[model samples]
Target: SLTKQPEEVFDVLEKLGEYGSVFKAIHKESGQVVAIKQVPVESDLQEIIKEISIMQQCDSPYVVKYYGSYFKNTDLWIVMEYCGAGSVSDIIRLRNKTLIEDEIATILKSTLKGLEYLHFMRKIHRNIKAGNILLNTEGHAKLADFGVAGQLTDTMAKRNTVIGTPFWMAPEVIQEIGYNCVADIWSLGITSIEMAEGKPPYADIHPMRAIFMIPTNPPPTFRKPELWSDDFTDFVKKCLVKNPEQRATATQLLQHPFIKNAKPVSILRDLITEAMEIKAKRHEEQQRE
Candidate 1:
């Protein structure tokens, strides 16, 4: 049933954009500060609504804040917190590449803590990537977009249908082999490389080709940029290992020297500014072509 306040809820906002058919709207209640996902009524079948109901039960600091939900007319209005700085994708593009070692450490370290908590509660962020990570006012990281994330039982290993952005996907995900929360560890390593190099390893080709190359070829080993530290180099190798069993879990990552010394908040601020400027310049240069 539709809530009485359905129209009143999203009436104040304008369309921000769309990821496929998903409508993202801004809400006036928080001074144009809330993000509401408006979905069609058909997909709002009884069972799907029940799953969304379970989503409201989460309370992890790493996850996005879920305000509430209701249906207005034929559309589902889901109230959510606004990530003002936008996604990790926006941050990466604005910075024109990946972040520095310190920044990557800070963001991923906090992310690890969140993943640790989620795993303890029998959940896994099955769709972790730069796109789903959001930056807070202080530049700390938070996880978002649980559309495909779910609780996993001990008996569950891999699924026939896989969900997640392909480029950031691990070998198991790419190969249709059984996988677990360890998949996020591989994604984190790719993110780290993106940060240090200012570009992901496979930025050159389509995601499918990249996935095939990851397992067959030598793992994408970066030639450290002149400015990067050797610690960052070693850290990427640890995370990008083809063997999921060999990849360091978030908890294990805490013990690494690179993370132990990285300062995240300040580094992100600088990286954001630099990335935005560089991207803008590249755009202008491209326009001239």
Candidate 2:
């Protein structure tokens, strides 16, 4: 029932945003620590409903787990598995830096697995960016947030909807043309640049400018090509191919030399640890100041 009261079990920890708040909650009698998100009732009922159902259907280890959902008065609460280490975006922002190539590869490799699983299920994770990639305490990457994810129709294999974060959006998407899983590959390519350079190609540009430039301009390259390997550069090129038909698939990308040569995902723990220490030290310094 959607009427279950989350407050019976969860204690609000912090406000996540205007629409929702995050809480540290424990399972009844199980003592399991989980995160609960509460969203105020709104016009986007379909989106919220899709996120709940889509999350329930995903079971890959590289995807976040959804426990259940409930409604309290005019609000909806979603219970989900928590990743203690935060997101790749958080890691970069906290440490004031970008990730090393190996660390980026590790994250990309795991994300490809997640995307492969989603595509196999005829789903499109339209939103694929660093912010949606969560990291567990062990530094494992898990794709999260299905609010904007799309499901393919049995009769048609593509979507023409123009929905997604502007900066990470694909050209076809920006143009409101039909796109498929390959659109996500384009976002993946942009996210790779975000990891390497600490921002996307047009970081300094306005959203409208970036959107306009994406299709007219040539595909972006690593800001410092000298710092990247040929294999990495090639992989990004394969992903950012302007033509959707020419872009690499998640399975194909998983086999690319860059991904194949990636270090184990667990090695990312060192990066996570470093970011944590940096944040801690910064906080200490702030206190001293």
Candidate 3:
């Protein structure tokens, strides 16, 4: 920690994070804008390195780019691409709390592509939710935040850890019986519901109750299923299947009509623009108050 000089290389900017402070910085040498996350000195070194190694394993356009990491005293700083448009959660909250079917399809398709890449690399992204999906200025959705990602030891190794946000947690995940990449698919289904409904099925309930209900309750659906298209409903049903064995893979879901037939992702630019403007206006209003 004493040997590295992240401060010498980059002009550290604003801080953000729920647990600890993360910084927005600009590399002086390359003039690159980046986000830096600080990790505690007492954290597992192997886990920190594994996160970087797993990031290096990915080369997908739909995933965020990981630059590098450095140490500063008792803190470790990780550098990553700065997503200007922020997260899908930010956009959804700023906009009308819900996105159109077309926008949701665009996000899902991009996320599926990212998942396809990770699954191919023998990695399971244990946490996949709207809050973890970030968008760039061009309205391109990219997968970010790998705090709980798991890499399979071998080709068929399964994980039994009961980890992930409760609302998006899959039934098999909650059961703690072995689960694999398919668990991510279940979260994607919940995220799709979140996209359309503005929240997950049990958003109003306590996390503990949601945990018990996930395994016992039937698969969730949009509040008004009839309002959504047949292809969309079918796609969600396939992803949210109770049994992981029956759930569709990312590759298969990529070919589903809901995504395959959706309009180009560029169409999301309008939505992103609207959301950004609304966010700015809200900020100005808050400043006045």
Candidate 4:
């Protein structure tokens, strides 16, 4: 159910980061700043279309909004909400320190609410790392990067596929066993560690090794559990349970003390400010060089 409008409706701006296929654009009619994800209309447009359709289905404040999509010749164009402050990944990269426990709680709480929306809709966001969490200047955290998301069937609402980034993937997922949205919880746990430590627990390990380790080793915990509150540690441990059945679901996690007494998302603004200052300084250095 995509808009039939032509791609010319958008006034395309410069490309975003060098990593992704997204670009900045402005809607001609609404003058809304948006992101355009340019995709080569591959031989089978079905895959991208399916993803787009799923993205279009999402309509939560926690989830990134999809405006419309169409084509530019053979290339398909996807319009999405522009999260101007970049992503949590950029925030961590520029902070030069681990995000505070309260900041981590705020971010995790926001993402959990997002998962509640997606999971209840029978959608699995296969990737839930820091990079997939976008932020705005207003201190709002929104989920993004649904390129690998899968919609589950109504029956048991289950799917099994070995997909997702190596470091954050769940044991059941890496084992290629049938897993549901709880797999997302495991990734969220790993993301929690990433926010606190500036890297996922297995960052130093080889991807292949980490994949093997996740399935074989005991559940992971915050490296410096002493540095964070017991509530935060307990919540993350609940999320990282090796057995999916034992893991805490998004809605259930929302009730955890870590999230229940969490700080407001407004606190996330300081991290955003720090990230921007570092970004500007880096830009200056690059220009001077």
Candidate 5:
């Protein structure tokens, strides 16, 4: 008769994997497992009006599914789609390899679709990187670990980037003042570099200083530029242009020759399978006997 709490509705399971406070749980009534992001209560009443407001606005399959939201006294529990395989960044670290151009092409293509959907809605997926790109067992790609509320926790843990940003920021975002969805394009370009190199450029730079370098330094290139395809390199070039107005929109990028001819999405499953097998062995290696 009354609205139920998350504890009453779902069975909290083991921490599937944390990209901040997110975890996996099963809906008690439905029996299917889902992901949950429990955002710690802030000292202020910066509750989740903003989080749900943005998530519900998105309807694209490229974006992660948002189930519902619940609050625990002050803490917020955001029920979301469970992406079993893991974020692209986690898999790269687990498998220790770069994505082939075929795979990179499809992944970025799907991400562009996601951004295209949000940009039209006047929204931005601010922290775009391999870390937020997710793949399920079916090899369906979706963006995750996004939203203003989640961004609070995503800061500080990573070593290479500064608080709340991983050096994938657009020049406008770094300098502040005027910014738009065009900023997301810049971050995606950096994501492409990360997809190929297994890390973003300036991997060794101090986080605070990276704020200065992103605008001052030349656009980053893969440590081994010759190894990349001309098409992918060119795509990254367009996304990285310092003039925000000169940047291409997501829809325009979706038409690029590289992504236009991307290998089928199903091909991603093979990479997922390989990373999963390595993940199994990883557990054994970490087993403290």
Candidate 6:
């Protein structure tokens, strides 16, 4: 495959799918992919543009590749990479009850690397959850959907907008207290627990009520047996700290023993391919029965 060159504008082919109101597209030129999220014209146009610009300017192997974007007719178009393996939601559905520790490690490490890159740019991705974490056919991960990201340097007061999913929200955010990039770290910890346990620790409540609980109460303890190593557990604990000042920074996390030492020696692509083949066969059997 040729290295994808950054294009100025992608040929808008047609609609592919819709999730929550965001529309997706396939490119006519290189057979690449794109997406366009639409909203009322009066709704926060500058916020949309700011996020689009951030996605465009962001260049990292771990981050989703944004080619280019434009406005035509009445809606805004945002071009993004096509991650064929689909969202973390799909991955969990397919692998349910069988996903191993290494798979979770692969995802967490890759996603965190992407977050670390964004943090270095002084960007805060206010929303970090499984749906926004995309995977490709190669089983490599990409962090996408930066619609809620903002410039950390520009804001002195913490953002007040409820920008995250209830189960994934940080306590500081739920409390109406000011939050920083540490909020993202807390989300990362929430995600780690969710990926391993197959559900949020607070999955039992209604969303409105759950969101309030995050600020009002302590975060639930992670199931320790599922954690891969002591270092990994400690790393999550650092991120999950109630005090934002004491939480781990993205740059600091990169140097942590968990991430640095846990690098897989073998090619992960082959392993995922093998697992996928097995999964396909099982799906076929399920259909026949």
Clashes of 1: 8
TM-score of every model versus the real structure = 0.75, 0.84, 0.84, 0.85, 0.84, 0.72
Best of the two (1, 6) by lDDT: 6
> Rank by lDDT, descending?
3, 4, 5, 2, 6, 1
Q: Order the candidates by TM-score, highest first — what do you get? A: 4, 2, 3, 5, 1, 6
Clash count in backbone of candidate 6: 0
- Top TM-score hit: 4
Runs off by more than 4 Å, candidate 5: 1-8, 28-31, 39-49, 71-76, 147-166, 277-289
List residue ranges in candidate 2 displaced over 4 A. Answer: 1-18, 147-165, 274-289
Reference-based lDDT, each prediction: 0.66, 0.79, 0.81, 0.80, 0.79, 0.67
| Number of the top lDDT candidate | 3
lDDT of 5: 0.79
Candidate 4: global Cα-lDDT? 0.80
Better of 1 and 4 by lDDT: 4
Superposition error at 228 for model 3 (Å): 1.4
Give the Cα-based TM-score of candidate 5 against the true structure. 0.84
Give the Cα-based TM-score of candidate 3 against the true structure. 0.84
The local distance difference test score of model 6 is 0.67
lDDT for residue 171 in candidate 3, whole number 0-100: 90
5 or 6, greater by TM-score: 5
lDDT of 1: 0.66
Q: Please provide, for model 5 over 58-82, each residue's C-alpha lDDT reduced to its tens digit, 9 standing for 90 to 100.
A: 7878998889878887777889888
